[PDB]
Amino acid sequence: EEFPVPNGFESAYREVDGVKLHYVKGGQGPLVMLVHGFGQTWYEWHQLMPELAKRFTVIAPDLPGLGQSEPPKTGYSGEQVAVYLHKLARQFSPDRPFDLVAHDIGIWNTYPMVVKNQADIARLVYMEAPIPDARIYRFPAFTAQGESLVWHFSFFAADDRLAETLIAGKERFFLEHFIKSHASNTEVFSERLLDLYARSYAKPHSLNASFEYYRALNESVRQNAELAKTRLQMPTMTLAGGGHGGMGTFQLEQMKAYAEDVEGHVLPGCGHWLPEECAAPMNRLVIDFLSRGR
Amino acid sequence: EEFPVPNGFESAYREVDGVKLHYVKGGQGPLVMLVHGFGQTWYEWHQLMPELAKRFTVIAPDLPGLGQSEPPKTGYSGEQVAVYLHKLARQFSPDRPFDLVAHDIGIWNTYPMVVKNQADIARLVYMEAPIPDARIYRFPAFTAQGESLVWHFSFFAADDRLAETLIAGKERFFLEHFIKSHASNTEVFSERLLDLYARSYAKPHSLNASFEYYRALNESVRQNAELAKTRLQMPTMTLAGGGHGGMGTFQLEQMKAYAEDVEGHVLPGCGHWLPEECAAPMNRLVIDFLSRGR
Amino acid sequence: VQLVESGGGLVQPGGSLRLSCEATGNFDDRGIGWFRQAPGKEREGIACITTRGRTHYAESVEGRFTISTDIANNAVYLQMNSLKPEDTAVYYCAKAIRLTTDRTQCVAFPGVSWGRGTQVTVS
Amino acid sequence: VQLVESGGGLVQPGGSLRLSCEATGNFDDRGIGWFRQAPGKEREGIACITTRGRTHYAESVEGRFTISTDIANNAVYLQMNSLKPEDTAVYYCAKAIRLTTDRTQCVAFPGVSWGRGTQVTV
Structure with missing residues (x-):
């Protein structure tokens, strides 16, 4: 167990097509x-x-x-x-x-x-x-x-x-360095948080896996050239950080090529690490988007 | 001595504004x-x-x-x-x-x-x-x-x-990896040649000095925005490798913004390291450009 | 282009008119909007519908126009009621986006090529 | 647009002209070329000189035309001897490049503002 599980949540595993996947689950209702x-x-x-x-x-x-x-x-x-x-x-x-x-x-x-x-x-x-x-x-x-x-x-x-x-x-x-290069708010990355993330991904197979996602990136691009002939039909929201290290206007501008129904927001003075750098306003946006009209 | 000096040449030093520069000199005539x-x-x-x-x-x-x-x-x-x-x-x-x-x-x-x-x-x-x-x-x-x-x-x-x-x-x-990923002809780099270059730049002060040229690259850009208001007036030749790892047509295309008098060549099937990848044709072009009309 | 307009004409102020937007081929993507361009101003999105059925109307046509999708006949209709002189323009339908930033508007899908259109004149 | 063309006119076959390209300000950069454009045909570079004095001529005009720089008057001249009906076009001067690939040509500097030019009719 690499990270603290929040109160009310379990840590568990499921096998999916022969791969044992770890997840963390809690709550009741629609998924x-x-x-x-x-x-x-x-x-x-x-x-x-x-x-x-x-x-x-x-x-x-x-x-x-x-x-x-x-x-x-x-x-x-x-x-x-x-x-x-x-x-x-x-x-x-x-x-x-x-x-x-x-x-x-x-x-x-x-x-x-x-x-x-x-x-x-x-x-x-x-x-x-x-x-x-x-x-x-x-x-x-x-x-x-x-x-x-x-x-x-x-x-x-x-x-x-x-x-x-x-x-x-x-x-x-x-x-x-990678986290701080891509952050506007460096404060939230305490010594403890940095250590916990460094331990996980320093596992030899995890360090390698991290980079395989990139070694497959060009293959993903080819795959998505075919899949993107069908626009996304579900209501969609994009969030990007507007400060140093964020994607700015690129997130929404790209999504205008994919989604029929898109809402976009750029969070000022926040970098790439939105859940940590700008927890409160990101949480408010995600909660409100998933709860409106329900 | 880090590299074999060819005979008829001397390896020497010269202090210039308090800095001791190493060089290899030989021959006779114009510099x-x-x-x-x-x-x-x-x-x-x-x-x-x-x-x-x-x-x-x-x-x-x-x-x-x-x-x-x-x-x-x-x-x-x-x-x-x-x-x-x-x-x-x-x-x-x-x-x-x-x-x-x-x-x-x-x-x-x-x-x-x-x-x-x-x-x-x-x-x-x-x-x-x-x-x-x-x-x-x-x-x-x-x-x-x-x-x-x-x-x-x-x-x-x-x-x-x-x-x-x-x-x-x-x-x-x-x-x-760096050399091979910028080369078309990867076999001209013998294990001894690689060892000679790797030993030289592995010196801690030389490793650091390598990347300080790059950490100064933005300052050089700002200096050249001023200096480039005067076009180059001397006969100029640009060379670029047209194979994997080379600059291709970019070298001449840029120089068209700098030189009044420019001759451009793209060596087919050669990468970045023209002196070693394409020694013969490269030497021939330099020797001819410097000798024509003299 | 692959959406063809029809249904336009001359109507007297207060009258009605139904425009249609017809598919020329496959009709899997039904995220479609109606746009009008006056001869003086620039093109404006006035109503759109997503494949799942969400609609949006510009404020100037809210309550008077109705956009709907008829899947059987590969068409999107724009019902126009209580027409007025201002509504006079060329009406175009194109693949569209329901875009929410600080407000919701209908915008054209980037890089669409526009077609003939259909003329609406109220006087 | 820092170079103004003058000196054109109507001439008969065998006649001669001197075109003048005059600088409107600073004249430290004297790598300047002469270009002509027939009505329908493309723009063509016919003669250029570099600040250091190196000339190049297009094969169609070599031996007849001479390009020179008058430093004292801030101008570049195109001495046109032995004109012909083929030499009828509008003539422009601009900042230029003596460019050698598999051959040498005169091309304009990237993104120059082309001025009015001067008409030469034969």
């Missing part, structure tokens, strides 16, 4: 799944989950290979990993549609599930990452202020396990 | 200075130098902090470093103009010298890197085939000594 992104685990949702649980059954899986979940047996591309996450959600909501909230590469691993099974999805929240498509080839390698937002795409995807080799042994050094 | 780039030293010129020494006095310095040269005292920006290289060349050709051949960040560290002292330059050869200007903010962070050409701008420029901390101890491993 909401929350999928974390790179450098983190289910724990980033730990302040949202109690609030959502008042009204929904909340499930927060660890991505395959990260946290306490086994690596995938098929592959790391978006379409393959979405199979694991879709089957997991559906174990818990076989008869009714469920809600999905995703952050960072959580988006990469849920988009194919969402687009191919639209009737299963009631509402969708995506924050702080591009859906894999050709727009990621337009991000700069370098800026007039220093390092750019996503130069790590090339670092993590490079051959000869370049990223693993250079980071092994120095995991906490790297993760703290 | 030609050859300025190497990142991951390498004077040695990359070791096959062109004997051919040029038949007609020219050839001097091949190691950049401040690199090879067997002391770090600079002023700083690592282009205008600062170029004062060192300009005074070095004038100590050997104080009364006549000289020729300049530069590769990679050797372009960065000589463009200010060239544009401010145009009458000291007879002919100019630049290869395989952008002059630092706003076009560098336009290179992609990632491509559909994997890692992009210059994501390492952000890697090397990052705060907290990010690149030194990760690469230290694994200097041979990284440099081999």
Whole structure:
């Protein structure tokens, strides 16, 4: 057990297509799944989950290979990993549609599930990452202020396990720089939180898994070139950070190419790590979006 | 001595504004200075130098902090470093103009010298890197085939000594990946050649000095926005590798914004490391450009 | 283009008119809006419907126009009642987005190519 | 637009002209070229000189035209000897590049503002 489980929640595992997936579940009612992104685990949702649980059954899986979940047996591309996450959600909501909230590469691993099974999805929240498509080839390698937002795409995807080799042994050094490079609010990342995240992803198979999601990114882009011929039909909300390290207006502008029904918000002075940097206003937005009209 | 000096050449030192610069000199006649780039030293010129020494006095310095040269005292920006290289060349050709051949960040560290002292330059050869200007903010962070050409701008420029901390101890491993990922012809880099370059830049002060050129890259951009209001007046030749790892058409296209008199060539099937990947055709082009009409 | 307008004409103020927007091929994506362009101003989104059925109306047509989707006949209709001189414009239908920022509006899907349109004149 | 063309006119075959390209301000950058454009045909660079004095001529006009720089008067001249009906077009001067790839040509500097030019009719 890597992270504190909130009161009222359990920690559990389910096997899905031969892969043992760790998740954290609590609450009662219609299902909401929350999928974390790179450098983190289910724990980033730990302040949202109690609030959502008042009204929904909340499930927060660890991505395959990260946290306490086994690596995938098929592959790391978006379409393959979405199979694991879709089957997991559906174990818990076989008869009714469920809600999905995703952050960072959580988006990469849920988009194919969402687009191919639209009737299963009631509402969708995506924050702080591009859906894999050709727009990621337009991000700069370098800026007039220093390092750019996503130069790590090339670092993590490079051959000869370049990223693993250079980071092994120095995991906490790297993760703290990566988190703070992408943050506006550095305060909320205490020594304890940084340590907990560094321990999890420093597990040799978890460090490797992290980068496989990137080594599959170009394959995801190809997959989504075909899937994106069908627009998303469920009400959708995008959240992006407006401060240093966030995606700004890019999150909504991209989603105008995907969603029939999109609401967008840019949170001022917040970076990439929305649940931690700007917990209160992000929680308010997500709670209100999933509760309106219900 | 870090690299085999070819016979008829001498390895020597010279203090310039309090900094002790190492260089290799040989031949007789008008001066030609050859300025190497990142991951390498004077040695990359070791096959062109004997051919040029038949007609020219050839001097091949190691950049401040690199090879067997002391770090600079002023700083690592282009205008600062170029004062060192300009005074070095004038100590050997104080009364006549000289020729300049530069590769990679050797372009960065000589463009200010060239544009401010145009009458000291007879002919100019630049290869395989952008002059630092706003076009560098336009290179992609990632491509559909994997890692992009210059994501390492952000890697090397990052705060907290990010690149030194990760690469230290694994200097041979990284440099081999870097070289091979910017080459078409990967076999000209023998295990001994790789070992020679890896040993040289693994020196702690040389590792640090490597990335300080990149941490000064934004300052160089701001310097060149001023300096580039005067076009280059000396006959200029640009060279670029047209294969994997090379700059392709970008080299000449940029130079069209700088030079009144420019000759451009793209060597098919050659990557970044033109002196070693495509020695014959490269040497032939340099030797011909500097010899025509004399 | 792949949505064709029809139904426009000359009506007297206070009269009614039903415009239709017909699919030329596949009709899986029914997130469609109605846009009007006056000869002086610039094109404006006035009503849209998503495939799941959510509608939005611009304030200037709220309560007077009705957008609906007829799946059987691959069409989207725009029922216009209590017409007035201002409603005079060229009416276009295109693939649309129900976009909420600080308010909800109908916007065109990026990069759509517009078609002939259908002319509505109230006087 | 910092270069103004003058000196054109109507001439008969065999005649001669001198075109003047005059700078409107600073004249430190004297890498300047002469371009002509026939009514329907494309724009073509025919002659350029660099600040250091290096000339290049288009094959269609070489041997007949001379380009020179008058530093003292801040101008570049196009001495046109032995004009012909083929030489009838509008003539423009601009900041230029002596550009060598597999051959040498005169091309305009990226994104120059083309001025009025001067008409040359034969």
